[PDB]
C-alpha cells in the first residue's frame, strides 16, 4: 500500500486540500475572535476545528510514512509535527497558552506554500552571519543589566530593580522609546549622572545595530 | 476633425496650460483653507474651481478622443480620469469625504509633468519585488493579532478587544511608538509574560524590515 | 601693494591665526553662557569678541582685494562673508535674533579648515541627485496638509486648525513621535476612521524616505 | 625560568582556564544581584570573588614577565589589565562607582576568547573613517546648543538652561524621543518660531546620519 498512499500524498490534490483547509481554518480562526460570530456559528466553527486538526494528524500521519527518517529531518515537517501537536493537547487542563498557540498552526500556510519557504529560509539563511555580534551584544546587555541593577534598583525598583528588570529596561532604551522623558530624565532626578551610563549605552547599542544592518546589507 | 483636435491635445500649449492651471487651483485649494480668505475672495475661489473642474473634463475628454482605447489602460491617463471624475460628483450628496478627495487634483501635477512620473515610476517599481515579503508580515500580523485579541482583549479593550482594534496596536508597536511606557508596561500590570509576546514580535517584525530594505538596497 | 598683501592673505600664518581665533571666539562664546562667568570675566570677553569680529573684517577685506569677483563667486567665502555680517549688525535695533545668529561664525572653522570642507562638500554633493524626490515628497506633505486642515482642524485646532500646523503635526507623524498615543489615537476618538488618513500616509512617507537611502546608499 | 612559565602562560590548559574562570564569575556576578541569594550563598560568592581578582593578576603578570614591553603595547592586554586594576582598587575609599565597575571585568571574555575580538576588531576598525564626520556632528551640536541655551534657557531651564543642559536635550532632540510633544510643542507655547530652530536641525543631523551610515555601508 505504500506506493499506493505515498502517491495520494505526494498527489496535488492532497496538497491543494491542505492549503485550503489551513485558509478556512484561517478565515474561521479570525471569527472564533467575533464575541458574536461565538453565539450564532459559535459550535459549528468548534466542530469544524476538530474536524480540521483530525484531517491535519492524518495528513501528518500519511507523511511520516510516506518519509519515515527524512521528516523528522525536514525543518518544514517537524514544525508541522510540533504545531498540530500542540492543538492536539486538551482544550481543558494545565493553562490556556496553549489553546492560544493553536492558532500558530496558521503557519502551516508557509510549510505548504512554496515562496513563502523561499523567504523565510531566505531571511533565516542570515541569521548565522549574525550570531557573532548578537552573541556580543547579549553579553554587552548583560553586563549593562548587572551594573545598571545594582546602580538604580535601589531607588527604582520598577525599571533597575531586577536584574530580568534592567535587561527588559535596556532593551527599551535600545529601541530608544520613551528613554529619555521616561526612564533618563526622572532618574537624573537622583543620580545626576546617570546621563553618563545611558548616552554611551546608546551608542554602542545604536552603532553594533547598524553595523549588523551593513553586514546583512552586503555579505 | 480627428487630426485637428489631435494637433491641440498633443500640442505644446495645451500640457503647458493644463499645468498652469493645476499649479493655480494647488494655490487655490491653500487658500481655500483659511477662513479669513473665504470671507473675502471667497467665491472667486468657489467659481474659479467649478471653471477648472469643466475645462478638466473638456481635456480628458478631448484625450480620450485622440486615444480611444489606450487612454482606458495607460495608468496616468486613468488616475486622472477617476481624479477627475471624484471631483465631477456634486458637491452636495453622500458624505464629505468626497468633498475633500477633490485635493486628489493636485496629484494630476505628478502626471502631467514628467520627472515627476519617473521617479513615483521609479518608486512603484520597486512594490512588485517586496510582495512576497509583504505577503509574509502581513500573514504575521493577522496571526499575533489574533493572539493578541484572545490574550490582551478582556482587560484591555481598547487596544486588543477587537481583531482590528489588535491590528491597529501591533502596528504601533512596529512603529515602536510608545510601546514600552504606552502599551507593554501597563500590559504587564495584569500579566506579567506578555514581555514574551511582544519582544519575539519586536524582533521578527524588525528583522524582516531591516532585510525588506537591504532588499531594495540592492536587488 | 597687491602682491605685498596678496602674499599676507595667502601666507601659511594669515590662516593660522584666522582658525587660531576661530577656536578661541569659540571656546569665549561657550563661556558667555554662563550666568557666573558673566559677571567676572564678563567685559573681557566683550572686548575680546569686538576686537575679533574687527580683525574678521579685516581679513574679509584683505582677502577681497586678493580675489576680486572671485571671492563673490566662492561658496565658501560669501558665507563668511554673509556670516562676519551679520555680527556686525549693531548689538541693539530690531531683534536678538541677529545677536544671537553671531554664534554662527564659529561655523567658518568649516571654511578655514580643509577635510571640513571635504565632508561638508561630500555631504552636499548629495543634495542635487535627492530634489526630484524631494519636491515629490513636498507636494505630498502640501496635499495632505490641506485635506487634514479641512478634515480635523474643527475639533483639532491645535494640531490641524491651519495649513501650517496640519505641516508640522504631519512632520511629526513622519519622524513617527508621538503619532499614535498622542495623535491618532486621540483623533480617533472623535473620527473612528482617521486611522485610514495616517496609516496610509506613514506608508507613503516612509517608503520614500527608504529607497531615498537606497538612492544616497547606492548613487 | 622564563620558558618554564612562558609554556605555562602560552599553554592551552591556561587560557581555557581563564575563560572557565571569566564565564564562572560572570554567572557569579548575576547571583550577587538577587539580594534573596546574598542572604543564603551570600559569602561563598564574596570569596570567591576575591580568589579570583587573585588568580586574574598573578595570571596578568605572569603574562608580563612572558611578554615584557610588548604587554603594555597590545590594546587587549592593556584592557585586560586596566580591568584588573579597577578590580584590585579597595572595596571601601572613594565612591562604590569603582565597586560597580568591577562587573567590567566580564568585558574580558571579549579578550581571552577569539572571534569575540574578531568582531570587536571589525567593528572598531570603521570608527576612524567617521571621525571626520564626527567632529563635524559634535561642531554642529555644540553651535546650535550654545544657540538653544541662550533662546531658551532663561523660559525652560530644565532643558535649555545651561550649555550641557541644552547638549542633552538636543542629542534627545536627535534620536527623535519626544522632540514634539515632550520639547517642541511646549516651547511653542512661549516661542511660536522655535520650530525654526529644530525642524532644520532634525533635517541636518538626520541627513548626516544617514550619510555616514552609507559611508560605513559601502566604504
Same mark, same amino acid.
Given at each position: 500500500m505504500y506506493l499506493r498512499i505515498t502517491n495520494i500524498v505526494e498527489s496535488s490534490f492532497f496538497t491543494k486540500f491542505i492549503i485550503y483547509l489551513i485558509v478556512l481554518n484561517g478565515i474561521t480562526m479570525g471569527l472564533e475572535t467575533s464575541k458574536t460570530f461565538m453565539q450564532s456559528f459559535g459550535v459549528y466553527t468548534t466542530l469544524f476545528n476538530q474536524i480540521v486538526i483530525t484531517i491535519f494528524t492524518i495528513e501528518i500521519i500519511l507523511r511520516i510514512y510516506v518519509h519515515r527518517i527524512s521528516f523528522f529531518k525536514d525543518p518544514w515537517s517537524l514544525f508541522d509535527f510540533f504545531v498540530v501537536a500542540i492543538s492536539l493537547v486538551p482544550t481543558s487542563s494545565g493553562f490556556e497558552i496553549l489553546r492560544v498557540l493553536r492558532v500558530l498552526r496558521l503557519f502551516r500556510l508557509v510549510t505548504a506554500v512554496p515562496q513563502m519557504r523561499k523567504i523565510v529560509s531566505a531571511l533565516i539563511s542570515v541569521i548565522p552571519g549574525m550570531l557573532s555580534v548578537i552573541a556580543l551584544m547579549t553579553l554587552f546587555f548583560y553586563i549593562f543589566a548587572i551594573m545598571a541593577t545594582q546602580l538604580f534598583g535601589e531607588r527604582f525598583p520598577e525599571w533597575f530593580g531586577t536584574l530580568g528588570e534592567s535587561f527588559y529596561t535596556l532593551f527599551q532604551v535600545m529601541t530608544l522609546? +520613551?528613554? +529619555?522623558?521616561?526612564?533618563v530624565r526622572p532618574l537624573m532626578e537622583v543620580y545626576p549622572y546617570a546621563w553618563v551610563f545611558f548616552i554611551p549605552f546608546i551608542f554602542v547599542v545604536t552603532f553594533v545595530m547598524i553595523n549588523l544592518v551593513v553586514a546583512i546589507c552586503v555579505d
Open positions: 522609546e +520613551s528613554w +529619555s522623558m521616561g526612564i
